[PDB]
Amino acid sequence: FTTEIHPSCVTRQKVIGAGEFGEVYKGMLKTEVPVAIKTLKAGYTEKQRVDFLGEAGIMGQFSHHNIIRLEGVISKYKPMMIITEYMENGALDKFLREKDGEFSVLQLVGMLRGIAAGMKYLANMNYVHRDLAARNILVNSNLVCKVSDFGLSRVLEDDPEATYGKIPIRWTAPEAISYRKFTSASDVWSFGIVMWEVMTYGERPYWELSNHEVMKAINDGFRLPTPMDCPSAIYQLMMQCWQQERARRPKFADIVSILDKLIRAPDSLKTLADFDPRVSIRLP
Numbered sequence: 001f002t003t004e005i006h007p008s009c010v011t012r013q014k015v016i017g018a019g020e021f022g023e024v025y026k027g028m029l030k031t032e033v034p035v036a037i038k039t040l041k042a043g044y045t046e047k048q049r050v051d052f053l054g055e056a057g058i059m060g061q062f063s064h065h066n067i068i069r070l071e072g073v074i075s076k077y078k079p080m081m082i083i084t085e086y087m088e089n090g091a092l093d094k095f096l097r098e099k100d101g102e103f104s105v106l107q108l109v110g111m112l113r114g115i116a117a118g119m120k121y122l123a124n125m126n127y128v129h130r131d132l133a134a135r136n137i138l139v140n141s142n143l144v145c146k147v148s149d150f151g152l153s154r155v156l157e158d159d160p161e162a163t164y165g166k167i168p169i170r171w172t173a174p175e176a177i178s179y180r181k182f183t184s185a186s187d188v189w190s191f192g193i194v195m196w197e198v199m200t201y202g203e204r205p206y207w208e209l210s211n212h213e214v215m216k217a218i219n220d221g222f223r224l225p226t227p228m229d230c231p232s233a234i235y236q237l238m239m240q241c242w243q244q245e246r247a248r249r250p251k252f253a254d255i256v257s258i259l260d261k262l263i264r265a266p267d268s269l270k271t272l273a274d275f276d277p278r279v280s281i282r283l284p
């Protein structure tokens with residue numbers, strides 16, 4: 001399983017993410033290229049070792065532009081490490097919140113197309129992500145968005161947005177919440193939420209509604225309102241991702257096709273969905 005990298009080829013330089021059992025670092029790989037490096041500290045359990053190397057094992061099965069590339073693993077020395085390509089701009093949700101208003105609509109839609117292409121690949125590889133959200137999309141210096149955060153039980157266990165099953169409620173499809181049915185179609189629901197995150201520059205879905213309030217609203221038929229300056233076709237597409245009936249949602253194949261057609265005829269994105277303002281400002 002995958003390239004075993006000698007520790008002398010890897011230099012950890014700066015902590016960029018942290019947990020109780022290891023950290024994520026920016027570093028360099030001299031087989032000299034930048035890499036992300038995730039560690040697992042000594043004392044780890046069997047389950048931790050299986051979850052940790054399982055993330056790398058899963059990533060090693062994939063070869064797609066919109067899926068994080070695995071460079072290799074350090075497993076025969078401690079601490080163990082996973083080494084991936086480095087995504088200079090980090091997580092998409094923080095990136096958009098820090099860059100509010102700085103992109104064109106075409107750029108934002110292009111990000112969505114990349115995410116959708118990665119998700120179509122995963123779904124057709126029989127991989128259900130379960131935690132698709134802008135926080136799990138990473139962005140590089142070419143503005144390419146790539147799906148990250150792979151594994152089995154570790155995905156939802158490690159995410160603080162996932163609460164008690166243990167689930168990140170406001171990104172998750174109704175059937176996954178209600179009866180634990182996680183499929184590529186529940187990932188499509190999540191993708192609809194990601195579309196809303198991108199078009200709003202990282203607004204938190206459903207604002208301050210509690211988890212129960214969100215579930216009640218969804219079950220009563222309410223959906224997130226249109227973002228400001230959102231192409232009508234983009235809002236229509238996200239709304240179809242939120243059909244209660246799983247079978248009525250687009251597949252990722254449909255999503256990629258639609259986004260590709262909109263990008264290739266970019267004037268189609270100048271028609272905007274009506275934005276319902278929450279504030280009335282009236283001047284004589």
Ligand SMILES: COc1cc(Nc2c(C#N)cnc3cc(OCCCN4CCN(C)CC4)c(OC)cc23)c(Cl)cc1Cl
Nearest residue numbers: 016017036037038068082084085086087088089090148149
């Ligand atoms: C290596 O192993 C793994 C690494 C990761 N995670 C990452 C991968 C991957 N993959 C790639 N690239 C990453 C880049 C990151 O931050 C870049 C610095 C952004 N700046 C931060 C400061 N602000 C103000 C400006 C932007 C990053 O940050 C936490 C995590 C990354 C995952 Cl999810 C799983 C495994 Cl197994």
